């Protein structure tokens, strides 16, 4: 169990020992941005719990040159001696410090080390990044990104989240740079040769993956929060203009979080910095939060309404992380969702409270629908789940940790009510401040939450409570909620609730929902097992808007309906993480209701119905003509979310058909959408006017009309593009329409070439983003390949965009094959650029394959994944893709003729 120069490595586990406990790091870093390298040193105050001969910690790609142990409690190690023997075992990304004399329990020691490396050239660790000025200059910065396990690439340390420590950081630098880190600068001292040295305030207790530091020449705008935090937004100097919105939102959002959590942001400053080469969307380093420019920067001339929404989300997400993630950290990556599922959810609570005009509450169900896609296939995972390798740990960052965690939190907030739920949050954050929680710690605090403070006297909590039947009720309801939620986190999957109505005899069955595996299928029963959930149902009826609630704890059950009404709608507003299927004439009652008075169902009830009908089709519980029949009402629907839910299914089929050459069906879908929905599409201005929803309805519908080659639409955009290009940018395309205008513009070699030129000159990354989409809508293979090839270079088109670009090319008919070929003929090369690992590789793989729907393609993809296995290239996304392609195949052979027929029938009457 041993490397490198022979000699046994004293330790076998990838998890570190618990024997030595870090307390404090002195960390000095001296980067040179001309020679693109750095020299560094550290001193780690450790406490030794049990006697040891060795210290195990993490270190990767670092050349350690000096190592010494000291102690003020253990005179054997009294200043200055002694040297440590250093042994490196790269396969666990560990090193061993060998001590001359067995360390003493309960004595503190100081581990000191010198190390050095080149600045990374790949998105992680302490790495090099570049940007372009308005003059055309090229500047360099050095930035850190450590989550999950890359801090060890920057300085040797105990790189696991449970090992929180104080960090005291110092940075030497040239006068043409500033240096930023987690904490405020205390002091800058002038050195002999003219260099400067920034000293930063010691951090509070925190995890290694959040340590951050940056050397750059960025500009900032500043403001103070109500509670007196200095919030600064940094960006390259020519872009300072674009940071205004971020300053405004982060102040407003930080204030809300302090009220909501009842806990102050503990640090005296908060920095948000727009990094030009940034792999993740954003990273929540405590006090120094890093973003993509597209995540932070906003520009009224070229950023759209949906750009604004996104920037607001991401800031909301990162600020939420200062509590969920930083203040309270998960014990180990198996509960990463404690961080991410929660930040994800706080987006909704915080944006809703601070910017209701953004309508984020109407968008949220999409968070849940996107997971359900993954969660209704066997290859899904439980929310909380073991993880060990860096690749495994990366894999935990997915729709299940984020969207599903958020969705089940939402479900529980609905159950407990806002007041009890926020109270649960507050005591959790307070109780675990500056250390760690695991899945159960969280469910205890949430299930034991006290309304109306504590409570009071002789209320249930706390002091001296009165023994009441009410008290007994409280205690058991609490334990109920605990049992319920743990099964939502340890069971993979989502349940289907099947509902049969017998006058007033509503009978309930629960079932694992399974996509493309029919009610009676060979393997269907084997996947049913002991999948059982405690499901907090809700429902209203046609004769009563009263919300009735009741917890289904077992496989089957019955409830009684006074008045024996027409329809019953389960899961009100879709706040529950489950699909509902109605037997008998239930679906016809609801569809009848929708065509006659849709308003009698709640707006979100409509969104969830539309969603469920089409899922169930795929589940073979309904036939495709039932779902298509529902979309008939959408002609009267003015609630944008349901309108867009419905449309998106019709649009999705069109691309599905169009991807194959099923042109007679795709043409009928084209004619059905432009004609049915002509009123709405024609109602839309080519402007930025109206409310946020108006603005987003517009870009949505006009994109759709332009995608179906609707002539007047294509004409208008073509005109706008022409005026723009002829005026050399001196005219303004309204932002909501920008991407559509550019892509129509890109259909000619002249327009295309012009756009690519604008790309290299533009100072709005949001604009660049839309341009790069446009170029990707090109019908010419020569162009799409050039895009791809440019992105390989990372010069003109930066490599943080390569994954998104292949994804964009692959989903259009002209691009899918080219993209699939490219990925297979350059896999080895893609891997030199990204971790296996990375969100990028996961996007590249799914982005180029998941849309496939033929047995042919299934074959090729099965063969490609089998091949990536050996080498030891394993990802969960392989199975997920195969089951997805399989889902699509079964869907086509099950429902395609029904689709063909339904459209032909619609042509006739009427």
């Amino acid at each position: 169990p041993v490397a490198t120069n022979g000699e046994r490595f004293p330790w076998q586990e990838l998890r570190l020992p618990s024997v030595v406990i870090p307390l404090h790091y002195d960390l000095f870093v001296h980067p040179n941005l001309t020679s693109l390298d750095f020299v560094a040193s550290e001193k780690i105050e450790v406490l030794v719990s049990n006697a040891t001969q060795f210290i195990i910690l993490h270190s990767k790609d670092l050349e350690i040159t000096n190592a010494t142990l000291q102690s003020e409690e253990d005179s054997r190690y009294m200043k200055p001696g002694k040297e440590l023997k250093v042994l490196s075992y790269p396969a666990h990304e560990q090193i061993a410090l060998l001590v001359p004399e067995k360390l003493t329990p309960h004595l503190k020691y100081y581990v000191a080390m010198d190390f050095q490396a080149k600045l990374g050239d790949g998105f992680e660790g302490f790495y090099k990044s570049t940007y372009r000025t308005l003059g055309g200059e090229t500047r360099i910065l050095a930035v850190t990104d450590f989550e999950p396990t890359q801090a060890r690439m920057a300085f040797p340390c105990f790189d696991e989240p449970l090992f929180k420590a104080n960090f005291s950081i110092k940075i030497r630098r040239e006068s043409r740079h500033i240096a930023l880190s987690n904490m405020p600068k205390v002091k800058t001292i002038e050195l002999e040769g003219g260099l400067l040295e920034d000293h930063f305030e010691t951090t509070v207790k925190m995890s290694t993956y959040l340590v951050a530091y940056i050397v750059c020449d960025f500009h900032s705008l500043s403001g103070f929060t109500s509670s007196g935090v200095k919030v600064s937004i940094y960006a390259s100097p020519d872009k300072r203009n674009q940071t205004h919105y971020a300053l405004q939102a982060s102040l407003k959002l930080l204030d809300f979080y302090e009220k909501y959590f009842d806990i102050y942001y503990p640090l005296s400053k908060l920095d948000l910095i727009a990094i030009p080469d940034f792999a993740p969307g954003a990273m929540e380093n405590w006090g120094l939060i890093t973003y993509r420019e597209t995540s932070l920067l906003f520009d009224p001339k070229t950023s759209s309404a949906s750009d604004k929404l996104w920037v607001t989300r991401v800031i909301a997400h990162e600020l939420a992380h200062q509590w969920f993630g930083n203040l309270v950290t998960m014990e180990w990556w198996n509960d990463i969702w404690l961080n991410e599922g929660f930040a994800k959810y706080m987006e909704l609570i915080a944006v809703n409270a601070t910017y209701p005009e953004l309508q984020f509450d109407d968008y949220f169900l999409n968070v849940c629908f996107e997971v359900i896609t993954k969660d209704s296939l066997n290859s899904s995972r439980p929310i909380s789940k073991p993880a060990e390798t860096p690749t495994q740990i990366q894999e935990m960052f997915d729709e299940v940790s984020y969207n599903k965690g958020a969705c089940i939190l939402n479900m529980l907030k609905d159950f407990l009510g806002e007041e009890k739920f926020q109270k649960g949050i507050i005591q959790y954050l307070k109780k675990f401040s500056y250390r760690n929680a695991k899945n159960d710690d969280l469910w205890s605090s949430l299930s034991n939450s006290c309304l109306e403070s504590d409570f009071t006297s002789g209320g249930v909590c706390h002091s001296d409570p009165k023994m009441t039947s009410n008290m007994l009720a409280f205690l058991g309801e609490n334990a109920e909620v605990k049992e319920m939620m743990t099964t939502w986190t340890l069971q993979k999957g989502i349940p289907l609730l099947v509902v049969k109505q017998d006058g007033c005899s509503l009978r309930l069955q629960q079932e694992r929902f399974l996509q493309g595996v029919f009610q009676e299928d060979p393997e269907w029963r084997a996947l049913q097992e002991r999948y059982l959930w405690h499901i907090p149902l809700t429902y209203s009826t046609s004769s009563s808007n009263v919300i009735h609630r009741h917890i289904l704890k077992s496989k089957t059950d019955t409830l009684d309906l006074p008045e024996k009404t027409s329809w019953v709608k389960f899961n009100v507003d879709s706040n529950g993480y489950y699909i509902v299927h109605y037997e008998g004439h239930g679906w016809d009652q609801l569809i009848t209701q929708l065509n006659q008075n849709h308003t009698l169902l709640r707006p979100k009830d409509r969104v969830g119905l539309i969603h469920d009908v089409f899922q169930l089709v795929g589940a073979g519980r309904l036939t495709l003509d039932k779902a298509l029949d529902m979309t008939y009402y959408l002609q009267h629907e003015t609630s944008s979310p349901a309108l867009l839910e419905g449309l998106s299914y019709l649009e999705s089929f069109y691309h599905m058909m169009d991807r194959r050459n099923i042109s007679d069906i795709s043409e009928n879908l084209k004619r059905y959408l432009l004609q049915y929905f002509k009123p709405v599409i024609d109602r839309q201005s080519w402007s930025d006017k109206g409310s946020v929803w108006d603005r987003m309805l517009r870009s949505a519908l006009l994109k759709l009309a332009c995608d179906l080659n609707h002539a007047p639409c294509i004409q208008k955009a073509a005109e706008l593009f022409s005026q723009w290009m002829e005026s050399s940018g001196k005219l303004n395309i309204p932002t909501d329409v920008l991407k559509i205008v550019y892509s129509v513009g890109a259909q000619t070699t002249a327009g295309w070439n012009y756009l690519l030129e604008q790309y290299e000159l533009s100072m709005s990354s949001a604009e660049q983003n839309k341009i790069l989409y446009a170029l990707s809508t090109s019908k010419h293979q020569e162009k799409l390949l050039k895009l791809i090839e440019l992105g390989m270079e990372g010069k003109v088109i930066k490599t943080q965009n390569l994954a998104a670009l292949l994804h964009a090319i692959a989903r259009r008919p002209k691009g899918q094959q080219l993209a699939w070929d490219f990925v297979r003929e350059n896999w080895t090369h893609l891997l030199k650029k990204f971790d296996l690992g990375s969100y990028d590789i996961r996007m590249i793989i799914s982005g180029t394959t998941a849309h496939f729907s033929s047995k042919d393609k299934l074959q090729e993809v099965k063969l490609f994944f089998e091949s990536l296995e050996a080498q030891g290239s394993h990802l969960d996304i392989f199975q997920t893709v195969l089951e997805t392609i399989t889902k699509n195949i079964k869907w086509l052979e099950k429902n395609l003729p029904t689709l063909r027929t339904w459209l032909m029938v619609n042509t006739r009457h009427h």
Partner: peptide, 9 residues
């Protein structure tokens, strides 16, 4: 977050 996706449209 890496949910930069928002990848494109």
């Amino acid at each position: 977050x890496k949910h930069h996706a928002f990848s494109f449209k």
